[PDB]
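Q: Hi! First time asking for a complex rather than a single chain. Here are the components, and I think there are two in total. Is that enough to go on?
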Amino acid sequence: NFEKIENELKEINTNQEALKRNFLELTELKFILRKTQQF
Amino acid sequence: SQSQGIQQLLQAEKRAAEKVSEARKRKNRRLKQAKEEAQAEIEQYRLQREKEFKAKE
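A: Yes, that's all I need. Here is the structure of the assembled complex.
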C-alpha cells in the first residue's frame, strides 16, 4: 500500500507538471500561429 | 500600419524569386545556344575533313 501510493503520487505529480507545461507551450504556439496567419 | 509591412515582405520574397529565376532561364538558354552553335561549327569541320578525304581519294 505504501509503495503503491508513493509511486502513484510521484508519477502523477511528474505527469501533472509535464502535461501542464506542454499545454502552456502548445497554447503559446496556437496564439503564435493565429497571428502569423495574417502574413 | 501592419498591411504595408506584410505587402513589402511578400514583395521582398517576390524580388528574390524573380531576379534569380530570370537568370536561371537565361543560363539554360545560353547553354542550349552553346550546344547548337557548336554543332554548326562541327558540321563545317566535318565538311572540311570529307572534302580533304575526297581530294586524297
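A: Chain B touches chain A at residues 2, 6, 9-10 (CB under 8 Å). Let me know if you'd like any chain examined more closely.
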